[PDB]
Design an enzyme around this catalytic site. Structure first.
Site, mmCIF file in Angstrom:
data_model
loop_
_atom_site.group_PDB
_atom_site.id
_atom_site.type_symbol
_atom_site.label_atom_id
_atom_site.label_comp_id
_atom_site.label_asym_id
_atom_site.label_seq_id
_atom_site.Cartn_x
_atom_site.Cartn_y
_atom_site.Cartn_z
ATOM 1 N N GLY A 130 18.447 -10.894 4.543
ATOM 2 C CA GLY A 130 17.161 -10.924 3.855
ATOM 3 C C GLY A 130 16.495 -9.572 3.726
ATOM 4 C CD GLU A 131 15.341 -6.936 0.710
ATOM 5 O OE1 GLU A 131 14.862 -5.815 0.424
ATOM 6 O OE2 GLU A 131 16.554 -7.121 0.965
ATOM 7 N N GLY A 132 13.235 -7.117 5.050
ATOM 8 C CA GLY A 132 12.178 -6.749 5.988
ATOM 9 C C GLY A 132 11.290 -5.711 5.329
ATOM 10 C CB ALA A 133 8.100 -4.182 6.440
ATOM 11 C CE1 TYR A 134 6.914 -0.498 6.141
ATOM 12 C CE2 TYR A 134 7.942 -0.056 8.256
ATOM 13 C CZ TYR A 134 6.811 -0.333 7.511
ATOM 14 O OH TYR A 134 5.596 -0.443 8.147
ATOM 15 N N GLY A 135 13.068 -2.398 4.257
ATOM 16 C CA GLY A 135 14.372 -2.585 3.633
ATOM 17 C C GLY A 135 15.102 -3.857 4.009
ATOM 18 C CE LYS A 188 15.865 -5.400 12.698
ATOM 19 N NZ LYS A 188 16.734 -4.325 13.234
ATOM 20 C CG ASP A 217 2.765 -10.085 13.891
ATOM 21 O OD1 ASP A 217 1.972 -11.072 13.682
ATOM 22 O OD2 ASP A 217 3.615 -9.686 13.068
#
Length: 344
Positions: free
Chosen positions: A22-27, A44, A139
């Site tokens: 999948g996608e995470g915040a910066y890639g 990641k 978080d």
């Protein structure tokens, strides 16, 4: 260079046979076969270097995860990047591959009381260490609790983590907040920046309630609905609890609300262990000063089968000023911080 979906995922030769997650915040995220340790792992791709805020987050999480060494906290196994600052456009973080996370598990599986108890123990054991390093996670939520097929639990995603700062925790009413809404403590919406340890115990309490029912306990649909959800269960704050809220906008807002009575936990959760409910009540306390601390939670009768302070380590090296560094300096520090993984 290995591709995935027309995007470079240049990780070899140690890491072979890739698959997209999948996608995470910066890639992007993929799994891969480690050929040294003979187990598959998660990778990641991060590309933070154009933006200083992305650099700060990346550097902060690398620093924290490399400092920490704990069974219940995700580790960094490896970091892949170019040999020179000039050629470094991307960093790849290698971590243990975990089959699932608590969010996915709660959508799909009934948890036994033994599972609830064991997951809660592991969350709190990891948190004890984090807090002992003077760090706040900020978080915590089910999707940030990873699980493997033997139910080992690891806390991840330190992207909002901060060094604790109770002296500068105060702020005005309705101050914007970064962390995921449903697990935010009531004080975030009232007068807190989320710079004390009590912010994390609230989020654990939310997660415990969600484990007892498979559903989020406070699914607020916007910033003040997150508070009207909290008060319909906990009841209206007492005068004592309101004496702590000195800011008038926050005070007067609470005073303007219709009086609500507490909903008993045993009515919301009729099949729950009574010791689980007692501990839940103490974590989901409106007043952060009265909220149970991590060590008290570990020592609660609910966790008695697990509690063992000599096997609940504290950090050797607690964090004892990234905000105003330019992105060029942060790139240099990220380069330095990742140097230990380079072949040598």
């Amino acid at each position: 260079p290995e591709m995935v979906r027309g995007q470079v995922f240049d990780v070899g030769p140690r890491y072979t046979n890739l698959s997209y997650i999948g996608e995470g915040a910066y890639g992007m995220v993929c799994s891969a076969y480690d050929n040294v340790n003979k187990v598959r792992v998660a990778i990641k791709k991060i590309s933070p270097f154009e933006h200083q805020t992305y650099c700060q987050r990346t550097l902060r999480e690398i620093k924290i995860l490399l400092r920490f060494r704990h069974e219940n906290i995700i580790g960094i196994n490896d970091i892949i990047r170019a040999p020179t600052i000039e050629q470094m456009k991307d960093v790849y973080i290698v971590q243990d591959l975990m089959e699932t996370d608590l969010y996915k598990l709660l959508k799909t599986q009934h948890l036994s009381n033994d599972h609830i108890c064991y997951f809660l123990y592991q969350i709190l054991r990891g948190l004890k260490y984090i807090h002992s390093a003077n760090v706040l996670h900020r978080d915590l939520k089910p999707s940030n609790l990873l699980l493997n097929t033997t139910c080992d639990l690891k806390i991840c995603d330190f992207g909002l983590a901060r060094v604790a700062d109770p002296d500068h925790d105060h702020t005005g009413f309705l101050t914007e907040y970064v962390a995921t809404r449903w697990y935010r403590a009531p004080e975030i919406m009232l007068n807190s920046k989320g710079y004390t340890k009590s912010i994390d115990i609230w989020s654990v309490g939310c997660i415990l309630a969600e484990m007892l029912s498979n559903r989020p306990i406070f699914p607020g649909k916007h910033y003040l609905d997150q508070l009207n959800h909290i008060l319909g269960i906990l009841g209206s704050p007492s005068q004592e609890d309101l004496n702590c809220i000195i800011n008038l906008k926050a005070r007067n807002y609470l005073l303007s609300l219709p009086h609500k009575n507490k909903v008993p936990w045993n009515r919301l959760f009729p099949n729950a262990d009574s010791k689980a409910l007692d501990l839940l009540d103490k974590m989901l306390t409106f007043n952060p000063h009265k909220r149970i601390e991590v060590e008290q939670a570990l020592a609660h009768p609910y966790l008695e089968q697990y509690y063992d302070p000599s096997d609940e380590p504290i950090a050797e090296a607690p964090f004892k000023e990234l905000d105003d560094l330019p992105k060029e300096k942060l790139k240099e520090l990220i380069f330095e911080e990742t140097a230990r993984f380079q072949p040598g």
